[PDB]
Amino acid sequence: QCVKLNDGHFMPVLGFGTYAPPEVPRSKALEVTKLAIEAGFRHIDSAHLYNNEEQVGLAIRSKIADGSVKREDIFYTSKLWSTFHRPELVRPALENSLKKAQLDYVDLYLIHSPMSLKPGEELSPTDENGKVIFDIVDLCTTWEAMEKCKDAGLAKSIGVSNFNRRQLEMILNKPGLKYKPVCNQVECHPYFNRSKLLDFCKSKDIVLVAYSALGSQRDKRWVDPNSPVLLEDPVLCALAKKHKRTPALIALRYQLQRGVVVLAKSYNEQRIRQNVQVFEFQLTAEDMKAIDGLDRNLHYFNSDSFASHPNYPY
Ligand SMILES: NC(=O)c1ccc[n+]([C@@H]2O[C@H](COP(=O)([O-])OP(=O)(O)OC[C@H]3O[C@@H](n4cnc5c(N)ncnc54)[C@H](OP(=O)(O)O)[C@@H]3O)[C@@H](O)[C@H]2O)c1
Ligand SMILES: O=C1C[C@@H](c2ccc(O)cc2)Oc2cc(O)ccc21
Numbered sequence: 001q002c003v004k005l006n007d008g009h010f011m012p013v014l015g016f017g018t019y020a021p022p023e024v025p026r027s028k029a030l031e032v033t034k035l036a037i038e039a040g041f042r043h044i045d046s047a048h049l050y051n052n053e054e055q056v057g058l059a060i061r062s063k064i065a066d067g068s069v070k071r072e073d074i075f076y077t078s079k080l081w082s083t084f085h086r087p088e089l090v091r092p093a094l095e096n097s098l099k100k101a102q103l104d105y106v107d108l109y110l111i112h113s114p115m116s117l118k119p120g121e122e123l124s125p126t127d128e129n130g131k132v133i134f135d136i137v138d139l140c141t142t143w144e145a146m147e148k149c150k151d152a153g154l155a156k157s158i159g160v161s162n163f164n165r166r167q168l169e170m171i172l173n174k175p176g177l178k179y180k181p182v183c184n185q186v187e188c189h190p191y192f193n194r195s196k197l198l199d200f201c202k203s204k205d206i207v208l209v210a211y212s213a214l215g216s217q218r219d220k221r222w223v224d225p226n227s228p229v230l231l232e233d234p235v236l237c238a239l240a241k242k243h244k245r246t247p248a249l250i251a252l253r254y255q256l257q258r259g260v261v262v263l264a265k266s267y268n269e270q271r272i273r274q275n276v277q278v279f280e281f282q283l284t285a286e287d288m289k290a291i292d293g294l295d296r297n298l299h300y301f302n303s304d305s306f307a308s309h310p311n312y313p314y
Helices: 027-039 053-065 087-101 139-151 165-172 195-203 234-243 247-257 269-280 285-292
Strands: 002-004 010-012 014-017 043-045 075-080 106-111 155-161 183-187 207-211 261-265
Touching: 010 075, 014 027, 014 269, 027 043, 027 053, 027 269, 053 075, 053 087, 075 087, 087 106, 087 139, 106 139, 106 183, 139 155, 139 165, 155 165, 165 195, 183 195, 195 207, 234 247, 234 285, 247 261, 247 269, 247 285
Parallel strands: 014 043, 014 261, 043 075, 075 106, 106 155, 155 183, 183 207, 207 261
Antiparallel strands: 002 010
16 A cells, blocks of 8 residues: 655555646646546656646546545655755746646655756756757755755645766765655666665665656657557566566556655546555565566666766666
């Protein structure tokens, strides 16, 4: 069901991923988020970047209004985008996300990325020649503002995302730190299991939350289309046939059994309903080591632009 975070709040171990590319109409996010909740999902992952907070927020309020759930049954996550790292922009950004979602609080607010961008109204500020424009921000000052947000009850819990071990220790060793990150949300799948990072997070009681756990949406803007398709993996497919389940269910169950909290995006009613079946079966110890063996040091997200960022975690 849930795992106890280091601030005493509780996070459900299966989460619905709400990101869709801009080519998908905004109305779908409202439709599918209601369906996710209808199928059993209680953890819901959004962000300012996704341009979908209004719709995801309305789906939550929809399912509270019709009596299916109460607000305290729902774990709602947003993320501070990289153009708002400067400490004075953090709380208005969160307050802006609350207003879009028409909620009083988020269950979880994250620094979306350590790679600061130029402040402004543009998600991806690019210079006179189309190159992204970086900013330089001491992320400890950003974290201090995150902590103020938790102390104001605007975020029940705070954490980070796309941080490496070095960027985490910077927070953990900050003088006067008040709140440790409750999680580190990072790319994690059988082709990149992050076992070393996972062990470091366990050592600090930091939850690792896996994104692109099914191999990502393979958007060619960000992912090489000729990379291996995770769900087409023969070991995963052979384990699906063995357990009368499906490659995606295998890949999801793998993370739960390693103590990872796992996200799964789908905008397809039947696949949404299928993913909640992850709680219905068990992987053996022999299957787990076989999935461990698929690790290929492959992060699907690749960008020559962000690779030169003095904050690039890889
Ligand atoms: N913090 C970060 O930097 C970050 C980065 C990436 C993602 N995330 C979060 O993590 C979420 C999930 O990651 P993701 O968007 O990369 O996708 P994902 O969870 O890895 O899913 C990849 C694809 O799998 C398909 N799928 C879903 N269930 C399936 C099933 N049972 N059988 C077969 N295929 C299935 C989906 O297609 P259909 O929609 O057609 O079903 C989806 O496009 C995101 O939505 C977002 O909330 C965070
Ligand atoms: O699929 C993407 C694209 C990518 C991105 C978009 C715009 C940009 O300027 C930089 C990165 O970040 C993401 C973050 C997320 O949480 C989920 C999905 C993605």
